């Protein structure tokens, strides 16, 4: 008796990564990195029309 | 954590090795904290004392004398269990397995003997190496004490019999005590010896004070203060028990010694001091039955 047990392949997917800066939605916002909001309490915007 | 590595014996059947794999997260009592221990030392066949397998009382004795260690990783040819008693308090979170009621975000699980619930259910036998493992049930201290006292009372009624203690409402759904059938006959036969030590220690306690109070305060501040706050309580209970009962300072004092010891030996067995607490985080906060639960070393 010779009877083997084969593994006939191994597949895996690459999880891809989406940027968000290479999209449409990113026009809808002005994004900025304020690394210090964390130490901040309030923030505001003036708007005189 | 101080892991202690229990050594699986020689070749075991493939279905037995899968029985152990499912035992991760179960509480083991290890007789000594030696780093290298055998499996036979842990197995329930190592609880034999008087030539018999221990009853629920004989178990509760042993659970108070050896060290419970939760099983962390089960490996072929080794079981790694980290003793609950060793290290600093509030550290070494190791996962448990919930059995029965939920185990909410705290409450200090007690590991009480298995027979209190489905008896043989949890025996987990290993035929290849011819041994067996009975894992204690991890119940919260308020509920563990309520139950163990709840069953002793049922036992007393049963002792001589001619409101159901059994139905239990815990959390969301009514818990069930009775498995009906003859399980009760198996449950009641193992609590048989715990019931008696309870019945004895009561009947021996009252009659010993009911004889002592009237055989004391008749020989100062003792007298006045005693009868003062005992009005219609101790004295009333004295006339009523002496009514349906019988009545010696020398045997009194020597029996007051032997009772006082036996009593506190039951308070030690009983009260199921908590081994651990549950303190969760980034967790469900309620551990559903059969789900691993975080747990920490001191209440």
């Amino acid at each position: 008796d010779v009877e083997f047990d084969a593994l006939l392949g191994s597949y895996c997917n690459t999880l891809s990564l989406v940027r968000f800066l290479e999209l449409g939605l990113s026009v809808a916002c002005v994004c900025t990195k304020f690394p210090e909001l964390a130490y901040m309490n309030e923030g505001r915007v003036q708007f005189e029309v | 954590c101080f892991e202690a590595d229990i050594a699986i014996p020689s070749g075991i059947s493939r279905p037995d090795a899968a029985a152990l794999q499912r035992c991760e997260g179960r509480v083991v009592f290890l007789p000594t904290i030696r780093r290298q221990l055998a499996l036979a030392d842990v197995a329930h066949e190592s609880f034999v004392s008087g030539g018999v397998s221990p009853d629920t009382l004989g178990l509760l004795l042993a659970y108070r004398r050896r060290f419970p260690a939760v099983i962390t990783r089960v490996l072929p040819t080794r079981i790694v269990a980290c003793p609950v008693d060793l290290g600093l308090t509030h550290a070494g979170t190791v996962n448990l397995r919930n059995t029965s009621p939920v185990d909410l975000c705290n409450g200090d699980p007690v590991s009480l003997v298995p027979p209190v619930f489905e008896g043989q259910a949890t025996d987990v036998r290993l035929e290849s190496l011819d041994l067996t493992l009975r894992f204690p049930v991890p119940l919260p201290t308020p509920l563990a004490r309520e139950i163990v006292a709840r069953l002793v009372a049922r036992g007393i009624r049963d002792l001589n019999p001619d409101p159901d203690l059994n139905v239990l409402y815990y959390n969301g759904a009514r818990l069930s005590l009775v498995a009906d059938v003859q399980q009760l006959a198996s449950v009641n036969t193992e609590l048989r010896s715990l019931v008696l030590n309870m019945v004895y220690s009561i009947t021996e306690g009252t009659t010993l004070i009911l004889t002592l109070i009237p055989r004391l305060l008749a020989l100062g501040y003792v007298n006045a203060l005693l009868q003062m706050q005992s009005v219609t309580r101790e004295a009333a209970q004295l006339i009523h028990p002496e009514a349906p009962m019988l009545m010696r300072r020398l045997p009194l004092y020597e029996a007051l010694v032997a009772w006082l010891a036996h009593a506190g030996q039951l308070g030690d067995i009983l009260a199921l001091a908590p081994a651990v607490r549950v303190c969760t985080f980034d967790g469900a906060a309620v551990v559903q039955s059969g789900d691993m639960a975080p747990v920490i070393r001191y209440p």
């Binding site: 990195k33 690394p35 130490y39 901040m40 309490n41 | 600093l88 509030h90 550290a91 909410l104 975000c105 705290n106 409450g107 200090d108 201290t141 308020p142 409101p163 409402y169 815990y170 959390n171 969301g172 908590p274 607490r277 303190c279 969760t280 985080f281 980034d282 967790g283 906060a285 920490i296 209440p299």
Partner: protein
């Protein structure tokens, strides 16, 4: 910038056995046995991965418990940096138990109506309501227990921040509980110190310390842009400070519920005692100082040990903090270590 007495600072301004440990053991080979003869964002990502570096280069004075609850009872925002949160467990027994453990002459239906009524006043789904704050008890029993308006000042705090209904409904529950031999303890165990709430709408995720020292937590001036930190008793009404007579020892902190059993109609007293006595000595001093023993059963108080304040001195009493418009005698406790303890009242 360097001292005159150098040896005391090399240790102050700042192992080799583990180095020597691997040295004989690990350096040794084949032993044993022997044979004879991208400005800011990029910076942030890199730092997070690195932080995983250092924290993964190594490895206990802190424990955090975290839980999600509603804001009906409790409420993290009203409260502050140092606060006692007490857990509340299993609303399911709307006096189901009232059936048992309730002596005859007791309309055990009181709890079910008192309590179910509480629910009407304030269903099960996304979350449950746990986490009673220390505050919310002081107000609920404020008119009940002994000092009024130092006590009611706390009640003004909660009505204006956390509803007088819920306080009144919850007070009716405390009365109904102390009535039927289901106590406020055997409910409401200690939960922690309230590190950070993170609330949304009617929801709150409360982090709080299972045990360990408080002051070493989020720290800062205050936790987040709130105010400082302290375990302020919140009552000049609570913070019963024992040790009227004392010697230096670590003060201790306990949690006591005092009750009235027809002397006042099921009184609820809740406060903290601070003195150096190990729980086996507190039961004695609780027997004294108390005339609440009115049988008018005999189970007057129930206590658990919160922890240590391993320094006697920080016991500041301040009727000076604002949790909104209201001002409360506030006693500040400087430094605390939490030992959860267990509830002991047998008598």
């Amino acid at each position: 910038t360097k001292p005159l007495p150098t040896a005391p600072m090399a240790w102050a301004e700042s192992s080799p056995r583990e180095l020597a440990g691997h040295a004989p053991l690990r350096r040794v080979l084949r032993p044993p046995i022997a044979r004879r003869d991208t400005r800011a964002t990029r910076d942030d990502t890199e730092q997070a991965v690195d932080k995983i570096l250092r924290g993964a280069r190594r490895a206990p004075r802190y424990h955090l418990t975290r839980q999600v609850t509603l804001t009906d009872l409790c409420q993290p925002n009203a409260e502050r940096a140092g606060a006692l949160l007490l857990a509340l467990r299993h609303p399911t027994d709307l006096p189901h138990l009232a059936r048992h453990r309730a002596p005859p002459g007791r309309q055990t239906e009181r709890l079910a109506e008192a309590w179910g009524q509480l629910l009407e006043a304030s269903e099960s789904g996304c979350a449950r309501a746990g986490l009673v704050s220390f505050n919310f008890l002081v107000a609920a029993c404020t008119a009940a227990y002994d000092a009024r308006d130092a006590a009611e000042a706390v009640r003004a705090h909660i009505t204006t921040n956390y509803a007088g209904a819920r306080l009144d409904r919850f007070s009716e529950c405390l009365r109904a509980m102390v009535h039927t031999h289901v106590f406020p303890h055997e409910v409401m165990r200690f939960f922690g110190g309230l590190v950070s709430w993170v609330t949304q709408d009617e929801l709150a995720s409360v982090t709080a310390v299972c045990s360990g020292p408080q002051e070493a937590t989020h720290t800062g001036h205050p936790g987040r842009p709130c105010s400082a930190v302290t375990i302020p008793a919140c009552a000049f009404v609570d913070l019963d400070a024992e040790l009227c007579l004392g010697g230096p020892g670590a003060a201790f902190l306990y949690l006591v519920f005092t009750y009235r059993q027809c002397r006042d109609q099921e009184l609820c007293c809740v406060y903290v005692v601070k003195s150096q006595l190990p729980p086996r000595g507190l039961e004695a001093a609780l027997e004294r100082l108390f005339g609440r023993l009115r049988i008018t059963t005999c189970t007057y108080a129930a206590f658990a040990e919160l922890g240590v304040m391993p320094d006697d001195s920080p016991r500041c009493l301040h009727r000076t903090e604002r949790f909104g418009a209201v001002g409360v005698p506030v006693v500040i406790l400087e430094g605390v270590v939490w030992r959860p303890g267990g509830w002991r009242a047998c008598a």
